[PDB]
């Protein structure tokens, strides 16, 4: 036999029913299907590394590298989806599978020397050359809906965004999956491509929970928010303590 | 989400083509089908524990307890199968799955200070043994024809050792089947305990004039125990199918 060994593994049984803590996932609909979000895979891999290290995720700065999404995961209206995460033996590589089929691959590891400066927002050489006209929340999600990205309330975290989709303000509700998804939504917002494009690859993602808590601010209505910047030129989306580099999307 | 954690896992990608070291598995056919043997699950679970302990199986005396076989694994025409073993976190429990479906559960653990005393104990020739088994629906090809001789009542005999734990232990299950009063086609669904001690096994093996290595096997209905070499099987339960 060809034998493959894993230093640790975990299984996450996902239930989208009304009373489930994962009910929020029903608000992530793309081309009329409820898709488990790419950032949900990041969350369960992060939780698996945290378990292997004996840490809480909120105390675990983490790096993902060379993430590849091999297929989409449909969440049915009724039943449960079981996603398995495996950490490869003597390696930083990980796999996510469903019913044995590979869904995600990549490398994941504890970030030993978190650099708060990584989360500084990138700056152009000169200010904005055309006058920026901010779009409100409902306008943002209209535009997204028209192109096939149907986000219900739990995934509507973009409160405002620039006309070019290069800056905005994201809600924080102590949910890493939806926060990080709204960073990907911002990356999509300013794209000129037509139709539904879904993430297939991400070169690197850095998360530092301490820097995140510092970068959050509170609005007069007590909502917590973080500012987001997208540089398509630099292949970078940054918000709070999350830095996403080299997002690639493909027609779906 | 409900989260389940595992201290270790391993995936065994099995190919039964003639080029593969696992070709021998094509000789374990039941009711016309190539069935992955229950003792093959024991083998891959043992190998997974050995990996976690930094040991080879030959240095790992091992106990299985409360084994439950939830379904049979019939190999496809492709002749391939992928079996995953998970060791549960902070526990002796294990799972074997195929395509996410649970195939085997139970407990497995390193046997500290094995006690060799556990293994202390007209005929039917090999061809007659396998004629009888075939009449009941058990089709064993040459790699699984390890019963050399058996008692007329099927409660004692000699088993060949071909440096194959899977086929050796399968022939112990075969002896259990041979002497049963029920002659239908039954597959294992539960085993209360299996002890394996490679050291006692090497001591129990003996060589015949032709240089073949063998071990004596005993089946005790009173005790529901089958013992051979350094393997002790207790509480084998089989059901029809």
């Amino acid at each position: 036999s060809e034998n493959l060994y894993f230093q640790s593994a975990a299984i996450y049984n996902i239930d989208t029913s009304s009373e489930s803590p994962d009910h929020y996932l029903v608000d992530h609909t793309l081309d009329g299907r409820v898709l488990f979000p790419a950032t949900g895979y990041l969350s369960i891999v992060w939780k698996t590394l945290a378990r292997a290290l004996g840490l809480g995720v909120e105390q675990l700065p983490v790096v993902f590298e060379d993430v590849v999404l091999h297929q989409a995961t449909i969440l049915p209206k009724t039943g449960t989806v079981s996603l398995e995460v495996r950490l490869l033996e003597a390696s930083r590589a990980f796999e996510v599978s469903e019913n044995g089929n590979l869904v995600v691959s990549g490398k994941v590891y504890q970030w030993d020397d978190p650099d708060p400066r990584l989360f500084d927002h990138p700056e152009s050489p000169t200010p904005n050359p055309t006058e920026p006209l901010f779009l409100a929340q409902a306008e943002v999600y209209k535009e997204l809906r028209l192109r096939g990205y149907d986000y219900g309330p739990h995934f509507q975290g973009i409160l405002e965004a620039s006309l070019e989709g290069d800056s905005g303000r994201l809600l924080w509700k102590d949910n890493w999956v939806s926060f990080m998804d709204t960073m990907l939504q911002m990356s999509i917002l300013g794209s000129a491509k037509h139709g539904l494009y879904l993430p297939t690859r991400v070169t690197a993602i850095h998360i530092d929970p301490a820097t995140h808590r510092q970068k959050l601010y509170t609005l007069q209505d007590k909502a917590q928010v973080a500012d987001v910047v997208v540089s398509r030129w630099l292949r970078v989306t940054v918000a709070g303590g999350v830095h996403i580099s080299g997002l690639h999307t493909e027609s779906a």
Side-chain angles (χ1 to χ4, degrees), chain A residues 1-225:
Chain A
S1 51
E2 181 215 32
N3 302 346
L4 301 173
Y5 300 105
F6 306 91
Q7 57 176 297
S8 64
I11 289 171
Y12 301 85
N13 288 323
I14 313 285
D15 180 11
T16 60
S17 95
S18 71
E19 68 93 63
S20 176
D22 297 308
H23 178 51
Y24 75 99
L25 292 174
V26 302
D27 282 345
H28 187 264
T29 299
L30 314 195
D31 209 8
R33 298 177 307 170
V34 179
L35 290 185
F36 192 77
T39 58
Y41 302 123
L42 304 177
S43 178
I44 61 173
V45 173
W46 192 10
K47 284 181 187 174
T48 306
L49 179 65
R51 194 72 178 194
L53 293 174
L55 304 170
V57 262
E58 287 275 359
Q59 268 78 228
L60 180 48
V62 61
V63 191
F64 299 84
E65 291 173 356
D66 305 320
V67 176
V68 179
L69 298 103
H70 301 272
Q71 65 176 55
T73 299
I74 309 307
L75 314 167
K77 182 86 145 83
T78 281
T80 283
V81 297
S82 307
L83 296 172
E84 181 172 312
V85 177
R86 291 177 299 273
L87 305 186
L88 274 66
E89 183 186 70
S91 169
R92 291 168 172 190
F94 72 84
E95 300 164 1
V96 181
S97 61
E98 179 211 31
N99 295 321
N101 296 332
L102 186 68
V103 181
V104 189
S105 53
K107 297 172 64 254
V108 64
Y109 55 94
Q110 188 168 16
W111 195 9
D112 286 315
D113 48 339
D115 180 7
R117 293 286 77 70
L118 180 62
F119 304 100
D120 289 348
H121 292 178
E123 289 182 358
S124 279
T126 199
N128 195 24
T130 302
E131 296 184 301
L133 277 69
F134 262 56
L135 301 150
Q137 171 168 261
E139 301 170 278
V140 167
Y141 285 96
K142 176 120 172 214
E143 268 300 305
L144 284 169
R145 207 162 29 241
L146 293 169
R147 313 150 51 165
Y149 305 84
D150 198 5
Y151 298 114
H154 284 286
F155 277 82
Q156 285 183 21
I158 306 171
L159 301 183
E160 277 207 311
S162 69
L163 64 192
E164 274 313 353
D166 67 310
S167 83
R169 151 177 326 171
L170 304 180
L171 274 173
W172 173 251
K173 309 182 100 273
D174 286 295
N175 187 320
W176 288 99
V177 168
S178 60
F179 179 84
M180 267 192 312
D181 191 71
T182 60
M183 308 177 57
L184 300 190
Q185 296 172 20
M186 290 280 326
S187 208
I188 301 171
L189 197 49
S191 175
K193 296 175 283 173
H194 280 320
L196 188 73
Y197 280 75
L198 298 188
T200 61
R201 277 138 42 190
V202 190
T203 311
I205 297 156
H206 291 71
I207 306 175
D208 181 16
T211 298
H212 190 68
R213 298 294 183 184
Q214 295 184 3
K215 295 217 63 181
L216 291 174
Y217 59 101
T218 317
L219 312 174
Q220 83 186 41
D221 82 339
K222 328 261 198 112
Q224 293 186 269
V225 299

